[PDB]
């Protein structure tokens, strides 16, 4: 039980995720305590949304921790795809948070607020500070690439929401501003999250690695030129992690073809293309 | 463009999904039209939630349609894992809908309602009728198994929400009832959705097929008993669809071992275990 905390603190990314998760949960709890007295209609909703984004960050942290585990004869490739699952979950979280922001903006535009306003803006500035700190901490530029990108996009979406509420507060002092700003924030969040979901779905759909896809015809041509190789059939290349490709091949060779040399040459050819793990089945054709 | 509609109507499951999607979107639009006049705070939120569940059903329908497409040298295994992705997305949708129901129940329990009540209950009965019709239509007991289970669980969750609001309405006439009922509905939704997410994550994590896992040691023992097979190493079995298993194997055999016979016997052994697609790499050991 205590080994989890030591492991999380040992890793840099896990430690940063734990720091941000604790900070978000504590600030959500503080907002809940400040809003339990009154103004529940907005503060309770905001606190629950913060707790929900906290759940998304916790999911990313759990995937990051689990990604370092070893094989157990059940997960033959290991838990390495936890990062891809976390990226997909973060993308869905961002889409649904954008839709929630859309709904809240529409509700505010179609309802006059009689609740306290100064407290709402003050805690929103604190949330903006939290989001800016999160952006600063997670600035980047067992494999762990998708999780960092997902959490960074999540922090960007939270920052967009914070700047939206701040700009609405500023413009109201100096009615149309709030819905337009909410729609713009939601659209920006969706457009930003699109590439992450594209990559995660590409990985999760057993698609050919996009980087490897260009060089596959050349590799097939070079394998075909090997002596004794009649044909190449049933080729399947898919992605496991970032820069980790797994490919399966079936070769049909001459009845007396040099199986060892053909196998070694095929492995070299597909290793020069970046396929770390490869399985080649050599079939000896009949005549 | 028009080919999509003909294809959707051709398939039974796609036709049913399109029927339910159109019905849900039309009823959400009707509720929006009825609530545009007044009582926005609850009716607008309910209509947007219906449109959001409509988006989840549309995602399931799109996965069902795409699951029938052919290979294009990019998706080597095809788009067959769209059903698994749809199941995972439906599971996440159910979890987040349960959390939304939790939040709405807490808000209702911590805020006295001054809005119209008779209209809210009447449209809720209509939603319950819609959910019961959906349960009746999708009663069951390119592969398409996860999508049906996901949409069925979604309809079950919507039915649970409808019975919760109806029971709260009945009990209020005859304050504590609403939050307790909301919590119970959310817990039931999460517990119901747990197995679907378990199966979808197991498929998406490149885990060994749970049905095949029991018989793998026996198959390894029977392959080891083959003449000339020194050892069996680097075995990876994962799941592509329902009852579609893909396995990769590496054998180390004698310098003069019968490669053809060993390959045929290994393929027969793993085909009798249900592995439809298998790749065996035979390495000729040096001494």
């Amino acid at each position, epitope marked *: 039980i205590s080994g989890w905390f030591r492991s999380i603190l040992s890793d840099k990314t896990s430690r940063n995720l734990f720091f941000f998760l604790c900070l978000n949960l504590s600030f959500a709890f503080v907002e809940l305590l400040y809003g339990i007295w009154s103004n529940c209609l907005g503060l309770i909703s905001d606190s629950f949304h913060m707790f929900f984004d906290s759940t998304a960050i916790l999911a990313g942290l759990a995937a990051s921790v689990i990604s370092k585990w070893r094989d157990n004869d059940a997960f033959s490739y290991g838990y390495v795809r936890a990062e891809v699952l976390a990226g997909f979950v973060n993308g869905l979280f961002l889409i649904f948070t954008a839709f929630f922001i859309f709904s809240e903006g529409v509700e505010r535009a179609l309802a006059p607020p009689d609740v306290h306003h100064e407290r709402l803006l003050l805690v929103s500035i604190l949330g903006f500070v939290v989001n800016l700190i999160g952006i600063f901490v997670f600035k980047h530029g067992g494999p762990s690439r998708q999780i960092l990108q997902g959490v960074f996009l999540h922090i960007l979406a939270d920052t967009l929401g914070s700047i939206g509420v701040i700009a609405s507060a500023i413009m109201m002092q100096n009615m149309i501003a709030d819905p337009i700003c909410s729609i713009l924030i939601a659209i920006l969040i969706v457009v930003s999250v699109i590439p992450l979901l594209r990559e995660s779905v590409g990985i999760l759909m057993q698609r050919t690695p996009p980087l490897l896809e260009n060089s596959l015809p050349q590799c097939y041509q070079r394998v075909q*030129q090997l*002596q*004794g190789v*009649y044909s190449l059939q049933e080729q399947h290349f898919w992605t496991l992690c970032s820069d980790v490709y797994v490919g399966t091949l079936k070769l049909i060779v*001459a*009845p*007396d*073809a*040099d*199986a*060892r*040399w053909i*196998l*070694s*040459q095929t*492995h*070299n050819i597909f290793t020069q293309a970046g396929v770390r793990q490869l399985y080649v089945q050599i079939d000896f*054709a009949a*005549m | 463009i028009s080919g999509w509609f003909r294809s959707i109507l051709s398939d039974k499951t796609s036709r049913n999904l399109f029927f339910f999607l159109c019905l849900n979107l039309s009823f959400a639009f009707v509720e929006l039209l009825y609530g545009i006049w007044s009582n926005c705070l609850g009716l607008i939120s309910d209509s947007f939630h219906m449109f959001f569940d409509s988006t989840a059903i549309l995602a399931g329908l799109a996965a069902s349609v795409i699951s029938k497409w052919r290979d294009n040298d990019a998706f080597s295994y095809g788009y067959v894992r769209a059903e698994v992705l749809a199941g995972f997305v439906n599971g996440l949708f159910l979890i987040f809908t349960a959390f939304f129901i939790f939040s709405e129940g807490v808000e209702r329990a911590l805020a006295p309602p001054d809005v119209h009540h008779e209209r809210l209950l009447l449209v809720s009965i209509l939603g319950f009728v819609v959910n019961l019709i959906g349960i009746f239509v999708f009663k069951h007991g390119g592969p398409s198994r996860q999508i049906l289970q996901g949409v069925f669980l979604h309809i079950l969750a919507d039915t649970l929400g409808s019975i919760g609001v109806i029971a709260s309405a009945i009990m209020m006439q005859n304050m504590i009832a609403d939050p307790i009922c909301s919590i119970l509905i959310a817990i039931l939704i999460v517990v119901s959705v747990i197995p679907l997410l378990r199966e979808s994550v197991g498929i998406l994590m490149q885990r060994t097929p749970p049905l095949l896992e029991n018989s793998l040691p026996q198959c390894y023992q029977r392959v080891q008993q083959l003449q000339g097979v020194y050892s069996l190493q680097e075995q990876h079995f994962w799941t592509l669809c329902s009852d579609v298993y893909v396995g990769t194997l590496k054998l180390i055999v004698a310098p003069d071992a019968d490669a053809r016979w060993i390959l045929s016997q290994t393929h027969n052994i793993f085909t009798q275990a249900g592995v439809r697609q298998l790749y065996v790499q035979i*390495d000729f050991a*040096a001494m």
Partner: antibody
Framework: EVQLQESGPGLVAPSQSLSITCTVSGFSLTNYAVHWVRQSPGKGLEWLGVIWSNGRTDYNAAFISRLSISKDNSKSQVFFKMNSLQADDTAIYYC????????????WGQGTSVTVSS | DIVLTQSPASLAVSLRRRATISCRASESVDGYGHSFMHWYQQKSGQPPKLLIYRASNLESGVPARFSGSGSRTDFTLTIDPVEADDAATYYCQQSNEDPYTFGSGTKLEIKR
């Protein structure tokens, strides 16, 4: 009892083609590959080409524009044809079957000496 | 292309002493632990006879006195004990890279 017999012209003009027939016995061409190797005093043993069971041919990079290797499974004959013979192409042309599942040539035939002169 | 160099060019050994022929490749001819180097024996006016395939395996029917070793680039053919019938020319062939190449022969002279 495995023999490979070459039958070809000993003397070839310095501008004509060459044709050597390699008649095999004791094994079937349907499951063996026959290589073509020439040996000359000034250049040593050189690998020209090989023809496989299904008819696929692999040629040397420096002879790909001139070689032409055919088969006749029923007659158990392998035909070697080279164009644009020159004074440096005189050698002893051997046809040798490929060792099963290896890149070596276990059985060789006593090739026919070829000279290219006017 | 792979250039195979055999040293020495001419070797003189006694009737029963130890004989060693070395063939060095320009680049490695190894793959997955297999060295694709083959050794041939060509007597006077005869086609070459395969002795060693994959640099360590004796051809079926050859005398046991022939041995092979080496890996990557350096390879060694060992004849022990030598006999009067071993006076021939020995070539090394690599099948690792197209085209197949034969090294310059190593003439063996039996002293008496």
């Amino acid at each position: 009892e495995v023999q490979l017999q070459e039958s070809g012209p000993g003397l070839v003009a310095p501008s004509q083609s060459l044709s050597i027939t390699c008649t095999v016995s004791g094994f079937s061409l349907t499951n063996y590959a026959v290589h073509w190797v020439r040996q000359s005093p000034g250049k040593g043993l050189e690998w020209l080409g090989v023809i496989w069971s299904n008819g696929r041919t692999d040629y040397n990079a420096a002879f790909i524009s001139r070689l032409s290797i055919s088969k006749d499974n029923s007659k158990s004959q392998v035909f070697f044809k080279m164009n644009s013979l020159q004074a440096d192409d005189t050698a002893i042309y051997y046809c040798a079957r490929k060792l099963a599942y290896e890149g070596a040539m276990d059985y060789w035939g006593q090739g026919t000496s070829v000279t290219v002169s006017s | 292309d792979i250039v195979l160099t055999q040293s020495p060019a001419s070797l003189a050994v006694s009737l029963r002493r130890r004989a060693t022929i070395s063939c060095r490749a320009s680049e490695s001819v190894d793959g997955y632990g297999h060295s694709f180097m083959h050794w041939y024996q060509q007597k006077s006016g005869q086609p070459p006879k395969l002795l060693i395939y994959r640099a360590s395996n004796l051809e079926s029917g050859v005398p046991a006195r022939f041995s092979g070793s080496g890996s990557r680039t350096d390879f060694t053919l060992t004849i022990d004990p030598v006999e009067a019938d071993d006076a021939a020319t020995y070539y090394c062939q690599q099948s690792n890279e197209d085209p197949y190449t034969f090294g310059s022969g190593t003439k063996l002279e039996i002293k008496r």
